[PDB]
Amino acid sequence: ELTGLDEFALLAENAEQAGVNGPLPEVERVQAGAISALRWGGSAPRVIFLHGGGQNAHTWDTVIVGLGEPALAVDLPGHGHSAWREDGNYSPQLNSETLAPVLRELAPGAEFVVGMSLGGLTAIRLAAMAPDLVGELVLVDVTPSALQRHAELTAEREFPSFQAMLDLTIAAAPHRDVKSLRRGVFHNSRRLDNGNWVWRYDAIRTFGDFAGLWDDVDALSAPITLVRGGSSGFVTDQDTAELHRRATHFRGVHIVEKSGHSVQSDQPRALIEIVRGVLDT
């Protein structure tokens, strides 16, 4: 299997995963350097989606299809089709600084932001440095403290075959449907000329200053709602109460059963329902 394959070849699998029938939504990869994004059915968008570390904007495909709504899914810097830095800084503070121009242009009227991990926190930042852009906010299995805990704990390249990247991520999660895993890896890697394959994402040398972030939370007037992986230990009861404590309008936690950290990968049907309810109807 050789892959001169369009990045949207597998949309139908996404539609099936979402349990939605009917015609697929309009889509194009869009850019304002230094950023790439996929704009959806638009003539839009009502919602912005920010992915997590190691991921790219394709993790939201099934969620976005499942959801009726026009939207902007962004490749954070260091990720997918967005520029790397090699100062290694894809901190939420940096990420927001550069996205803010881009979201003014593309998706000027987006009511909502949905961020998982790295994207959730950069969305926090974006909400503080640009309240006009962030009407309401949705965090996917992340708290400023919860990611710092992760950063601390994990403070510590060319592949002969696509299959070898596949096996590697099979090892990460053997219990998962290969067809899905293959999809995610497809959108997350590319072939060189050598024949050899490589990850589209950069390795992260730096997360941000997590305390200014909390001052941003204190400062945020946008309502936050949190979504947790029922089987994810990433975010704790303590982390949650704290979020509630510091937050101006905390709308609560939805805890999704049988989902890990990446809720959009694990139980997108449920994430769809949660997000749907957040659009006030």
Numbering used by the authors: 38 to 193, 205 to 329
Give excerpts from the publication.
Rv0045c, participating in ester/lipid metabolism in M. tuberculosis, was predicted to be a hydrolase belonging to α/β hydrolase fold family based on bioinformatics studies. The Rv0045c gene encodes a polypeptide chain of 298 amino acids with a putative hydrolase activity. Sequence comparisons show that Rv0045c shares a low sequence identity (<30%) to other members of the α/β hydrolase fold family, however, the consensus sequence G-X-S-X-G of the nucleophile elbow and the catalytic residues are highly conserved. Similar to other α/β hydrolases, it has been previously shown that Rv0045c can hydrolyze ester bonds within a series of p-nitrophenyl derivatives (C2–C14).
The crystal structure of Rv0045c was determined by SAD and was refined to 2.8 Å resolution. The final model of Rv0045c consists of residues 38–193 and 205–329 with the missing residues being not visible in the density maps. The model clearly contains two distinct structural domains: an almost globular α/β fold domain (α1β1β2β3α2α3β4α4β5α5β6α6α9β9α10β10α11α12) and an inserted cap domain (α7α8β7β8) which interacts with the α/β fold domain. The α/β fold domain of Rv0045c consists of a mostly parallel, 8-stranded β sheet surrounded by α-helices on both sides (only the second strand is antiparallel), which has been regarded as the “canonical” feature of the α/β hydrolase fold family. Sequence alignments revealed that the “nucleophile elbow” of G-X-S-X-G sequence motif is located in the sharp turn connecting β5 and α5 and is highly conversed among these enzymes, although Rv0045c shows no significant sequence homology to any other α/β hydrolase fold family member. The polypeptide region, Arg205 - Ile252, in Rv0045c forms the cap domain. The flexible region in the cap domain, from residue 194 to 204, is not visible in the density map of Rv0045c. The active site formed by Ser154 and His309 is shielded by the cap domain. The nucleophile of Rv0045c is Ser154, positioned as the first residue at the beginning of α5. The cap domain and the α/β fold domain within Rv0045c provide a wide and open cavity for larger substrates.
